Symmetry: C2
Subunit: 89 residues, 2 copies
């Protein structure tokens, strides 16, 4: 559903549901040992009105993770896959 | 996907994707002629770490809508259906 996180023994990959969001609006903030994720839907006022959608979350990487190894790639299905293997994995 | 809004000619029904969220964490704030929606996933720190998910949005009702008529009901599938017929509809 929405709580889609791959918790392995030596790595991880979060699959955030951000369909109809743009890579430009998606942020992955790897700081120290925590990741702040963002994703806001371009505000488009109309019949439906102002859009202030923010489908994001937060993932705190284990202390034994090398930040460098952390990557992300939004798929066309709108799934933001954030894979961050642990140090020397 | 995530941008799921039913825009009719005399009414509307927004179907917000908030699976794995609780009605207690969901808010619908009908004020004047705008609706501020909220929905935060209970923070549960673990392997995955602190959870700060906020899958919400914003819908500005037409001026010809009676706020009283506006209702909402989270389904078991995790779809928050917010139906708000216009005045005298």
């Amino acid at each position: 559903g929405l709580s889609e996180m791959r918790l392995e023994k030596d790595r991880f990959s979060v699959n955030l549901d951000v369909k109809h969001f743009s890579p430009e609006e998606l942020k992955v903030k790897v700081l120290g040992d925590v990741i702040e994720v963002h994703g806001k839907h371009e505000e488009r006022q109309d019949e439906h009105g102002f859009i202030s959608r923010e489908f994001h979350g937060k993932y705190r990487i284990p202390a034994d993770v090398d930040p460098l190894t952390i990557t992300s790639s939004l798929s066309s299905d709108g799934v933001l896959t954030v894979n961050g293997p642990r140090k020397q994995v």
